[model samples]
Target: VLPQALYLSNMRKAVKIRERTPEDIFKPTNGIIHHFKTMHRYTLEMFRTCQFCPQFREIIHKALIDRNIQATLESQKKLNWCREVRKLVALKTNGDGNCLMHATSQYMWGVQDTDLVLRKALFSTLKETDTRNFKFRWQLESLKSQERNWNDEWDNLIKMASTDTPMAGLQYNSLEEIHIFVLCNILRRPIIVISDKVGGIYLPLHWPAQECYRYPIVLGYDSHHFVPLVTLKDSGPEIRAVPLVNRDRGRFEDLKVHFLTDPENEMKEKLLKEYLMVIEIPVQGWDHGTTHLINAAKLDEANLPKEINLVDDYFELVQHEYKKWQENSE
Candidate 1:
């Protein structure tokens, strides 16, 4: 039979295998295809959509004879295991310019909520300063234009930022400030912001005690667009390729290949020094060296409010005064 006819026959066989036992799939009988490379590409692409099924992966594995193709599939498996180990979950954003809210929400709730997380960040910024009149005031207004328009709601945020002292952690308008908010407020962890790189959002996650860094997550802003960097879980023959799904466009892009596979060690450091800002320490308090910031991050985590897992409990404890303000606003 020709390749198309053979594929159709095997597809029918796969359907029976799925129905009968849910444990197997029809594979090529001779470990061959009419055009191995084209078939390999097709199978790999299909895996993105059929990624949740074991049988699909098995079929792809059996059909793939090329060593290079097999290796590529294997790499994705290793990369996925890393995400599983990290308990990394991606949050969805409204694509209205609230990428920080979505990214930080995943760290907090393992879920995404545009309104809730935006409210959380807004409220926290309100508490920092009594008013909005400070440096970058006009820049902030310009920044808001680049994001989802808030209508009259922007008035309240501006009003709050106007009354507060600059020392009271004034509002953040750009990607760098957003990093500060997440590192200092939400995660209570250390993050290095690559400001000059991409939308100032690709933070290389590292613990202070560790000598080296792992792969960087793209929380960066591209133009006015914001998308959270998340691992795309696909069904496949275990490979070590990390699939980065751009939620803004709803597609998978290989960020791992660009960052880890292509970039050299020296270039990586240059990216770090030339564009990065250590946000573990206060952005305003840069005099605190890297060691101090690392210690501070650990200290803050240790001193987290009671019932850390319960969002209500932690938010109530941290935002007690802010809660009162919220109540009064209502």
Candidate 2:
């Protein structure tokens, strides 16, 4: 097992030469097709498109009922509410390779010291924007410090129960830990996630330019192979996760270049060391990006309060509301 640092060498080695091409997204496969057309779409677009549907209502109800059960579970042992909160908002598994919606939400809330940043900067803009610019969407935004205070408690409570694991020497992880670390204290349950995009979503909340839009999706794992689902320029979904002992080294290098090093900086190493190491998540897959070996080091830092709880609290309330709504419907 690789100790720490994002991106494992073993996972990097798993990719065959042909699978590394830019046209990998459109690979023909059930996993890929199901992901974007169903799972991925449901997570990202369904909230916007089908919020009024009975199915959506059912999801909310189920989540709320689960929340009560989880709260009971929490009283027994302080639960990982963050993970539960995440699942409440999570899009269930689609056969696609990418967990696009979950991934995007993870990116948005996982920022360091969000409360301090928001109070010092983000809140100022919101106040100004609300008074002079666009109309305030919710009444809560009008209340100062309420938003920050709630999230601060949630973020602090989560970090208190979290544990960290050091990177093993000569071992490294793929970006899978990125998702794991994000969901660790939040969700106490074990999970298997197949994702190809992180740090890939761009601004404006719309698809990026050809140069910017890039991601991967998980197809499925077989006896000895991990099928990659793709949506290439011309092709539809393709099942391309085939295992090969030794594939082209050039393709691996390209992934490192195009995906990892476009805006080169040594900060990624620091990012792995500081944030990831602090959280104590394990690296499961590595060796595919560059086979870069990473060792583990346990961190002894404490996490501070932040506004991440606003999102957390919002979801918790939503879960409660959902359950109540569901019970009534039934």
Candidate 3:
């Protein structure tokens, strides 16, 4: 291929113009409808509405699980225990075009309710200057050390992502990587993304200008949608081996050791240290790799974690833990 980022410009031109519908979630079509199937497909409403039955799971399974990608992640799990230590999972988000915002909201506030606020920041921050915040200057300096014309690139980005024209009655919208970079400044958190492509592991990314927020907010990217990913403890019943980000980079001393000894800092450091090695050929070199494209949009099973693993119903695992999470003060 002539490099995927270059290639996808064609499809991007097409899909960006297409109208979206709620009913589009049910069938298999290659556009955005298929892109974010997990959100609407496995949502709580699906459960309450009796839409979460056996055939539904079967459809979701067949639509999501690729035998090719299954083998890819399964083998990665064998060598690295870090990948195995925690179940790398994709938590559900609201369906609409706001999945990226929804997923990041869950990560930031531990709930999806903060999306509109975050969405406003995404647009405002993209257009805002360095007057009040250090992030604008940092973002500019970060881009100044770059290749592509990020000046024009950002203008185009603001225009593209600002396509908030209401569709599907209401709620659904759209997002792109530009949205991610803008938020990197607005929220002041590093983002580590594990996507479904072969070299899909994109390690901690934020403005090189700032680093905090546990140094992370991790997400799993499929074609067009995003889901939150956390390193959950390995249990007897549920899932198994996950390949590390890189061969040696993603390693960690046993999980319990960090939480016990280092508390939050050490544990987060473990993910940061190892994940740095997760990059494929070290994206963006000296230039912080945020703008570099890692397009997995065409991958049949692009966004979900690599393998298929479910102990309880897919949605229940997320819903139950989220309830516990919501109760927390922080």
Candidate 4:
């Protein structure tokens, strides 16, 4: 009996330690990791053909409804009235890797035609930058070994995107975050983005970036897929809960290169950092505008306004709106 008691005590101790171990605490189960990898893989496969699965569109439609709900609630609280103040102007992309550009176009112009043209112009400009900049140097040297010549690649991409056909083959397979800023300056409109790669919210080229809430809409990305989120009023309650990076900080310099560098691996490190940077791309023609700058930092201590109420209500609102969208879409 004494020997058995001692053995039981040791077994209990081992079990406690195993349970408390960091690896065990965070051990992923239920195929969650597999699901994430599969979704990412599937998005890229669809991107290869400029054809995305229906699920992507479904998610974006839901996101739009969610944004509109927050916007609607805010307008009700401020103006003391409920009205149809906002609506989705367009559902623009036809399963292309340029979904980001298309969504942005729809948000800003109520259409998607100009997005591809802007992408071509941005790529051409980036390729023409002075070789002195490390970012430019790396970009040029990095692709030397690819089967297609770099210039030929851009030329083909320009032609493909310009074709504006959903079934058209891709010459350029993706758009960097930097390209978004270029488009913003070209259109002189603000653009907001949420990326799994960069984490948090990003407002590129918007002076005093806090004003991003007033922008007509916001966009999101999951791995390589893109979606849109629209705004109804001057501000929305849901987004207010999110921490924003608006002012420049030295630590954010790493994010400036993220568009051209290894954006994925760095996201893990970003999660551990005290602050996340908002990369500010320079405007065209102005030599000063051409340099990439780390102009904003979203640190851990950041908090939203006290008067604003952040609640779980938006989640239900999105679900309700999504149901309505589904019925109509069907």
Please write out the lDDT profile of model 1 over residues 1-330, one tens digit for every residue: 012111122344334322332121122344321111111111001113133246333333343212232233234431222231111212223343344554543332323333343334344444443323222332443454465443455454444322133333223333334333323222322232211133222332221313222223333233333333332233423332222321122222212111211233335433443323222221122234422111011101111122222223322332454445446645
Query: Quick one: RMSD of model 2?
Result: 25.0
> Using TM-score as the measure, which candidate wins?
3
Candidate 4 or 1, higher lDDT: 4
Task: Quickly count the clashes in candidate 2.
Answer: 56
lDDT for 112 (candidate 1): 33
What tens-digit string does per-residue lDDT give for candidate 3 at 1-330? 011111122333223212121222232232111112222112111112123346343444343223233333435542222321324444455656777776765443333533264565555544543322223433544453357454554455565445366534444456655456455434544454554321232222333323323234556665566665543333333222233333333332222111111242435434544433222221232234442211111011112221211212334543454455546626
lDDT of each: 0.29, 0.24, 0.38, 0.34
Model 2 CA deviation exceeding 4 Å by range: 1-308
Q: Best by lDDT, which number? A: 3
TM-score of each: 0.29, 0.21, 0.42, 0.34
After superposition, the stretches of candidate 4 with alpha carbons farther than 4 Å from their true spots are 1-92, 127-172, 188-190, 198-217, 233-330
Q: Write the per-residue lDDT of candidate 4 for residues 1-330, one digit (tens) a residue.
A: 011111122344334322222122111243111111110100000001112237534454443233343344234332111122222212224336676666654343333423254455444434443212334433543554245355554445334434344343453356554455444433333344544243233322222323222222345545465554433232322121112322222222122222223443356344212222332332122234453332322211112122211111233343455567656755
Residue-pair clashes per candidate, as listed? 24, 56, 5, 5
Residue 325 in candidate 1, Cα distance off native in Å: 52
Q: Please rank every candidate by lDDT, starting with the best.
A: 3, 4, 1, 2
Q: Looking at model 3, report the run of 10 residues with the lowest lDDT sum.
A: 293-302
Q: What lDDT is reached at residue 229 by model 4?
A: 43
